[PDB]
């Protein structure tokens, strides 16, 4: 089997992407944030504290003929941005882009933090990191990908995120029409439960490529590119008037600037992030200070190849017995 679903930016900045997901019988369609940096499929629900719901579509298990309480199971998760959610668990039928899994753990939120409530466009998360990170207790649950894997034509999914445009998540196949050139595959460590890999270096604009190992994770659920402070300083030094602002929480730059591209290495291959991808617009409405899309990972404890990086590539998440990542230009 295969599946193919379109993923759509939630706003004009590509702050996140939502993908429609069918849950239950009859189907309840919720728009979920597919997150290769976490391993829980959780949803706003009929159980969510009413004051914490503001515009989201909810899953109502009582209206699904295939829903069953997973008795005793609870979940609770905290993300890198400080957001959180928790609740109980049902199993139900979940379909993505025509690919169906029966018996998927659907984590029903009883509580969500303010950032979730305030985002009316995201109805929950669908985790695509390794199932070792899943938070369900006392019986850890599998991700949608891990449950689908054995049925797929190939044990893979691909992320093809758009810049200010829709893109695609495919399950079970490579769309050879969706990228240019060849795919370069690179090793993955699953030791921390992430799609963790090592980039071979970087370049700023038209500058020379710096060969250096950068360990980080491929994380579709993170908006920005978080890299070591040395790398990030080297990038923003090429933008007149850019500076790190402790008050704003990262590098800012004049909205009048034209940003240089950023290149990262994948083995001997190179992915180029156009400068425009690194502009996250005014820090507050009407400001002439703009927020940068490349930020320091110092204090986060890991480098993160978030959407800024991933949307410059066609990315293969190879879940074969030895997982690997692939990157192609597009
Ligand atoms: Na922000």
Swiss-Prot record:
> Taxonomically, which superkingdom?
Eukaryota
The EC designation for this entry is 3.4.23.22
Q: Which cysteines are joined by disulfide bonds?
A: 255-290
**Record-annotated active site:** 35, 199
Instruction: Give the UniProt keywords, A-Z.
Output: Aspartyl protease, Disulfide bond, Hydrolase, Protease, Signal, Zymogen
Which Gene Ontology molecular-function terms are recorded? aspartic-type endopeptidase activity
Q: What is this protein called?
A: Endothiapepsin
Q: Which organism is it from?
A: Cryphonectria parasitica (Chestnut blight fungus)
